[PDB]
Design a protein around this ligand. Structure first.
Ligand SMILES: [Mg+2]
Ligand SMILES: [Mg+2]
Ligand SMILES: [Mg+2]
Ligand SMILES: [Mg+2]
Lengths: 1021, 1021
């Protein structure tokens, strides 16, 4: 009766911040409870550890108060068969919601809405009778969103909160020999919900593993590891403290052995009971061993050398009661003199923020995904990762320990939607609930060599609870620094200045919480801390413009030590339709209201782990090698702090406009933080006209754990010398034939004809024989299919008059009327000259003036010449070029310029100048939210079909007009047009991306000169 | 049903640190809910605040699971009618328990015994319909020990822990019109018991006030006061921040007024809504006014200047919603450069620890008692009080605010009997619970000028939780230091070094937590804080030995800023004898087990608030006036930091061996910390043989709110001269007659005769006529009826070998046998001379050797001459002197020496050298636990009845033989013996008292000389 839902629900513990648990065990690092040392040593699987993962029965309800009392005893006839772990939203029971800051529920802490999607999980299973004879048997839940009531065999067991840390319960007095049945009742919202407002998809269910662990009554209940070194790391001391539970006896001992593979390096045995700490004594049930290690191998992301520690509990005769263990890695993380050091050297953080997201699985993680993500970040030269914004799946930490990556363990606390942000975190009544999220976090992951910083959570302003919490960690684990960003990023609750989205050189002086220019911040009066951005370079869509700017500051200021790009992957989901054909879904796509539409898309990779183009920019900038060129000498500078360059080959190449003149290979032999000098054999000194370019690559001959042989880690390119062309055009044996009509001008020359509408003023059509070449005339373009950064957070409803898009619209840029001021056509001896002038106007105001001259000669080469005037008072145009719809549709595209990836003016350092040729298909980037894309810069010659253009411009070429782009909300809605659309730009505006909710394109990238000039040559073959 | 006892108790909330309250409302400053601004100004009584103190029905059960369900519905026929507040033990329901360290319950956290004296209180009452029309009705329990469930009209209402702070609940939705009934169920043991292990009587029940408050729906829910000054305090800024609950409407206003008397000093009005705090704006529902005050009058324990602040919640139009209020005192407490400052002057803390105890009422407090203690303290030179060790009665802070005493608020946390002491304090699972104890305290007391220091608790060792809660306070409130003694007194969780019992010059090097000499601490490498003993000078019984030594150091060192004596009032309880007579009881006096005996009495005053002789040693040492005497010039020094000597007259007197030759009076005119010079008119230089002695006193002409007219606040006394007596005793006509026999020596002279037992060697009898003088022979005495300090913790079951008592005992001091070595008579010209030589021995060893000469002259005077040899390898004896039981019983006692009060060698500075005369009665100290007492040192002449002694000695005289004192365990068990007992000490060991569990007698006070000699003259009248 007391176990009846009717009773258990009365109290409504999901509406009490005072009840965050009910009968839950205490936190600790990971246990398996080995019963044999070797197994323990080599990490084999423990029989004392059982997974309860797989097929469970499930049933959804709109409210806890609607679950049938019978559910405790009997399986619902209307129940399903689902797999655990899993997110409910992913099986169609209800919708995932995607809001950013706004809380999915009504803000009435600590209450939650009566209608509260309740999920009833249940499972029947067998228990070995042997597990009933001795020890203790607990159930461990790795993750449950957001809260839950538990039952076994009909009897109420416990209750938990915090979706992101494990929940343990003793079942010992409830199991039965034979068949037992579990019944979990999970809830969507609880008071917990106000502490978990992360900007991500709001799901729910039993998303992490479920296991049973069998322990001996007298057991190891906890253990911490530690490492101390001398002034040079030539000697370390490993210090292990072990705790016990159960009957204390004089014959119990603890043995601690440290292995180096198959080698045993140090061992220590002792009996329980430690130092006298206070007037009352010491701990009888604890012990600290101290192992000396000579010349330890240090762990680091560059070389994640690991050791194995085995902790055995046995009897004086040597009879083993139980075993626990862990990989250990020797490192010292410290802040000295303003710098964040690691093993003695100042780190340079190359990191990224990363959520646990999976397009099909939701919030469920799995090795494969975890590893894929790992290999990628490493291949792209990432050093660290931040657990935005909650503790991760247990195994994540193990993977970072072995692959080598710096982690930032973050507490499951975000209360963004509160006003002010402070509300909860400055309220003592909430201290208890928050404390649990910090403390159980440190209790669980503290022994991982990879965790090197602790974080108090995210965007919960600055409260007093924050200070209490910072002090707690500082006390229980003096070994790692502590960071929190809320409230201004440089509060008493943080060891590091960790702003989010603070610019390189421009201040953003918000009242109370300004973001100073990062260079400025360091020197503020009294400031001594290192600065490491927790979020920067907001990679939403076509972004990561200005990246090179940070890296350049990072490398020049000792106290600027990195940052974490926001973010790893796109939080997009998969959907279908007719043929159950998949499609990437975003905010709103589920009927979810409210929502932040595409704002859940900001990764460097698509949800499927395929790259956005921005990635490459990243890889290039974070490279570990830096090159300088002086004369015929290449200086290589290492940026590794511990390794020698031992899997590295330098490849150099020289070429004339894409034509290779000389190659070479030189093995790298540089010492962490050192230089090498590579001497170049005499270099080719051509006469032919052209650009001489030098290009270097760093190749890894051998494979590694995270890279296959041949991998390319770095590159650099230099322009050697130019040879201008002073060659005269071949004399011709005829000249074009100008022809007038009421309607247009027709110029012919053989089989080629060009036609110029007299009323429009534009080259309206062209022929190669009988074949018409255009579908739309060739006109001036001054706009673009607004980028995400361009739009910011402006909506139909909420209009942000600052977003470039709004400025462009309001200015009429999109609806301006082109007017012909003057067309003229003349025959000269050697050629035919056409001339135009147009003006664009919006409501009586002229924005732009286009003055051109075409010149066709005997060779059949048309020379275009553009001269543009931009009204000084009009919003800087996104672009200054031409565009037209081609009738042809070829397979490949070939150009001589920056490539091969999409590149923009404020994003093209990763781009190398050379001869590229790709499939048309690769010229359109499939961003989930359509906008301008595909651009390539610094182009000198461009070939598509029988055409060919030459000049100095940027271009894009695809089967979709900007219009289409700018009108389709999802890439899957896009349809290919008739021929190919070509945008030829003489000038393009930067894309920016310092952040996606404000203007970020810096001055240098704004088309602001007033007057632009360009010239093209257009010919066939 | 879900209100039923079976359901509520199912969860055993009192056995879970997870749950510490259900449905309890937030903490806050004190509320009244006035509805008329003046009544609030004037602290009238609000009709909105109703008391529920008075008669209540009560029933007692051995366990929670034994109360009948009917109780929820109806009263129990077998129920009684008690007065509330009260401690159930004081009514005989179960016994009170006295333990110090050792918990009164088996240590099994967080479990409590199934046997749990449960007290069911009930009350029936009537609510005015009005209270039900509008607003909210809350109930406030100001103290309930140790936990309790609560029901209203049948319905479960909530629950609470922490016996020392208020618990509020909303009854609003449970009330009816007319009759209403409460059913409060009080528990004895709860998980919260593990955090209340203060050394004191373990009682239980509803011990503080019970009230009902009615507050408007839209109301003032919080408010804090804050004062800032300029450099010289010439200007201050009063910052009041107000918080509101309810419906927020633009027409709401908050007005804050500052009054000083009837005069309005300042005021400020404003709408709600503060400054931006973070990216989400600010508090809509708060506002902060800032009132400028010029030349504000400052608050000190010296001058408790107070201002009244009024808070008005009204509509813009002027309608009033409600008014709250508080007394405000302007003062800044800051630590700077190692010093603790008050309005920029360095404090000198003259204070004491104080528990809230009442002989008749147990733990319940009252205006009277409270006020009494405040006056005693102020009258005896006290400066401040320490809330040992929990928050006090609300009324107590007001009283100190108004009376003038620095308080140290202390959280109700003590885990003393744990092992180690850290045990729960360093465990994150107890963080919430501890947190709730500090935060609510701060929340409620934060506005009392009186409170200048926060303390995190008592003897709980040092755990991480301490560091968290320390920071918390630091952030939340930065206007007061934070101190804590645990784990070393100098940890990271305390702004001040505050040891308990550290000696002045002796280090006590305990492991992990040593107690350095207070002078040495201050200077350890890197140390910089101020030192203030949280607890010193253990006042157990006959104690305070050495107190002067402390005050000389506090005086000498800057950073040595004072301490808190331990303690104020004895923790004794009253019982009754079959003849209706009441007696003081103590540990074990109730059948309680286990108990700590007399360890509950340590106060400087008797449970009835009567003074112990020690209260004078403290009064004099803590005086605020220091005197220096130069020739004939008295140099006065003020120790007040704020006041000028405005009610001070200095009286001076010169006297010869007790005779007054000259007097005087001079007004006192001294600035704080300044000096005054007083020049004494020529003093008589009489010829008369003797000792001239000058004595100064400071008297307070006018009465104070805390002291009557003619108050003596300080006293100055120096030896001016000596006139050695060259006289010879006029010739005598008569001459004693000696009569030898086989067993004696009769000496005769007139009506008097002296008989010396020849086998004893001692003077066996004496006669004045036919009247026999002695009842007991006169013999050499070397022992004392053991003091509390000599006993320590020594017990029968647990002998403490290091104890004085144990040593003396083990050495046979108490059982030595006198062996005659020599007894001889001799005839002289003018008289008769007896020579004896005795030896004390034990098991073969000779401890002492007394060699005497008696010399009866014809003047009728008997001259004694003592010479003692004490083995060097024997424990310095308690005393070296004589004793005998007299047959006479005089009424008074008159003497020439130190007094009036009982004084010992290491405690006599308070005593003045004069001629005292007091009723035999006053020469006995009624220490609840009997032992040696009443002594008076530096005696020159002692008169009792016809007898009269002369020499230089110390003596005590009562009706209790040392043998009985040491034999009786309670003062009410002693019976007067036939005559009068007299002890004439030639030397006496000090009493000590630096602590009562180790040997606290310093070197300079032990009788280690080896050889002693004293001389006496015994004569009649
Ligand atoms: Mg809850
Ligand atoms: Mg957020
Ligand atoms: Mg509890
Ligand atoms: Mg104690």
């Amino acid at each position: 009766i007391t176990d009846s839902l009717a009773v258990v629900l009365q109290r409504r513990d999901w509406e009490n911040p005072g009840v965050t648990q009910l009968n839950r065990l205490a936190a600790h690092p990971p246990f398996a409870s080995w019963r044999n040392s070797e197994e323990a040593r080599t990490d084999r699987p423990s029989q004392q550890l059982r997974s309860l993962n797989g097929e469970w029965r499930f049933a959804w309800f709109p409210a806890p108060e609607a679950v049938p009392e019978s559910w405790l005893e009997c399986d619902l006839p209307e129940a399903d068969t689902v797999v655990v772990p899993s997110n409910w939203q992913m099986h169609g029971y209800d919708a995932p919601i995607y809001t950013n800051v706004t809380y999915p529920i009504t803000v009435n802490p600590p209450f939650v809405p009566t209608e509260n999607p309740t999920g009833c999980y249940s499972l029947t299973f067998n228990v070995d009778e042997s597990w009933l004879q001795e020890g203790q048997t607990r159930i461990i839940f790795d993750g449950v969103n957001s809260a839950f009531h538990l039952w076994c065999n009909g009897r109420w067991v416990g209750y938990g909160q915090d979706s992101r840390l494990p929940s343990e319960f003793d079942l010992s007095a409830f199991l039965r020999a034979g068949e037992n049945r579990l019944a979990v009742m999970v809830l969507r919202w609880s008071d917990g919900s106000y502490l978990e407002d992360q900007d991500m998809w709001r799901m729910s269910g039993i998303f992490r593993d479920v296991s049973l662990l069998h322990k001996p009554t007298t057991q190891i209940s906890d253990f911490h590891v530690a490492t101390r070194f001398n002034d040079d790391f030539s000697r370390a001391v490993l210090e292990a403290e072990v705790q016990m539970c159960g009957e204390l006896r004089d014959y119990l001992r603890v043995t601690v052995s440290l292995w180096q593979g198959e080698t045993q390096v140090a061992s220590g045995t002792a009996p329980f009971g430690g130092e006298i700490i206070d007037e009352r004594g010491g701990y009888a049930d604890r012990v600290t061993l101290r192992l000396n290690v000579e010349n330890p191998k240090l762990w680091s992301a560059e070389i994640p050398n690991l050791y194995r520690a085995v902790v055995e509990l046995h009897t004086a005769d040597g009879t083993l009661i139980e075993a626990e263990a862990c990989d250990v890695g020797f490192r010292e993380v410290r802040i000295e003199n303003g710098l964040l050091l690691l093993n003695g050297k100042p780190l340079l953080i190359r990191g990224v923020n990363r959520h646990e997201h999976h397009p099909l699985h939701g919030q469920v993680m799995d090795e494969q995904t975890m590893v894929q993500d790992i290999l990628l970040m490493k291949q792209n030269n990432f050093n660290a990762v931040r657990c935005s914004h909650y503790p991760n799946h247990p195994l994540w930490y193990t993977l970072c320990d072995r692959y080598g990556l710096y982690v930032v363990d973050e507490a499951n606390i975000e209360t963004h939607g509160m006003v002010p942000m402070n509300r909860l975190t400055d309220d003592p009544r909430w201290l208890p609930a928050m404390s649990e999220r910090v403390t159980r976090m440190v209790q669980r992951d503290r022994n991982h060599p990879s965790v090197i910083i602790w974080s108090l959570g995210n965007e919960s302003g600055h409260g007093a609870n924050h200070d209490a919490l910072y002090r707690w960690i500082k006390s229980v684990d003096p070994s790692r620094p502590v960071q929190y960003e809320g409230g201004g990023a440089d509060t008493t609750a943080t060891d590091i200045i960790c702003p989010m989205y603070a610019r390189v050189d421009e201040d953003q002086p918000f009242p109370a919480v300004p973001k100073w220019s990062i260079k400025k911040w360091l020197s503020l009066p009294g400031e001594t801390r290192p600065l490491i951005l927790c979020e920067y370079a907001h990679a939403m869509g076509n972004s990561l413009g200005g990246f090179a700017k940070y890296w350049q500051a990072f490398r020049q200021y000792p106290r600027l030590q990195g940052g974490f790009v926001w973010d790893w992957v796109d939080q997009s989901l998969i959907k279908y339709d007719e043929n159950g054909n998949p499609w990437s879904a975003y905010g709103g796509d589920f009927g979810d209201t409210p929502n932040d539409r595409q704002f859940c898309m900001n990764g460097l990779v698509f949800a499927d782990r395929t790259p956005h183009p921005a990635l490459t920019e990243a890889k290039h900038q974070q490279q570990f090698f830096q090159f300088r060129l002086s004369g015929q000498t290449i200086e290589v500078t290492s940026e590794y702090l511990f390794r020698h360059s031992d899997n590295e080959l330098l490849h150099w190449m020289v070429a004339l406009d894409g034509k290779p003149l000389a190659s070479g290979e030189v093995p790298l032999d540089v010492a962490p933080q050192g230089k090498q000098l590579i001497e170049l054999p005499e270099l080719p000194q051509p006469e032919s006209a052209g650009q001489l370019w030098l290009t270097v690559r760093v190749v890894q001959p051998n494979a590694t754990a995270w890279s296959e042989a041949g991998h390319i880690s770095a590159w650099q390119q230099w322009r050697l010398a130019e040879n201008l062309s002073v060659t005269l055009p071949a004399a011709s044996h005829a000249i074009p034939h100008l022809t007038t009509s009421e309607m247009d001008f027709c110029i012919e020359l053989g089989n080629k004809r060009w036609q110029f509408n007299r009323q429009s003023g534009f080259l309206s059509q062209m022929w190669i024989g009988d074949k018409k070449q255009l579908l739309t005339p060739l006109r001036d373009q001054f706009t673009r299919a607004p980028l995400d950064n361009d739009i910011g957070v402006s909506e139909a409803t909420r209009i942000d008059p600052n977003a470039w898009v709004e400025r462009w619209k309001a200015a009429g840029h999109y609806q301006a009327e082109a007017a012909l001021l003057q067309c003229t056509a003349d025959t000269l001896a050697d050629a035919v000259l056409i001339t135009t002038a147009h003006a664009w106007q919006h409501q009586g105001k002229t924005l732009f003036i286009s003055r051109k001259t075409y010149r066709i000669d005997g060779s059949g080469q048309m020379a275009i010449t553009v001269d543009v005037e931009v009204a000084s008072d009009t919003p800087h145009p996104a672009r200054i070029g031409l565009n037209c719809q081609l009738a042809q549709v070829a397979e490949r595209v070939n150009w001589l310029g920056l490539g091969p990836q999409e590149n923009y003016p404020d994003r093209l350092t990763a781009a190398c100048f050379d001869r590229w040729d790709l499939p048309l298909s690769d010229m359109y980037t499939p961003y989930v939210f359509p906008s301008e894309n595909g651009l390539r810069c610094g182009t000198r010659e461009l070939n598509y079909g029988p055409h060919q253009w030459r000049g100095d411009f940027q271009f894009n070429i695809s089967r979709y007009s900007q219009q289409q782009l700018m009108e389709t909300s999802h890439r899957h809605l896009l349809h290919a047009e008739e021929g190919t659309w070509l945008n030829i730009d003489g000038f393009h505006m930067g894309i920016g991306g310092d952040d996606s909710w404000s203007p970020s394109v810096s001055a240098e990238f704004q088309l602001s000169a007033g007057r632009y000039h360009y010239q093209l040559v257009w010919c066939q073959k």
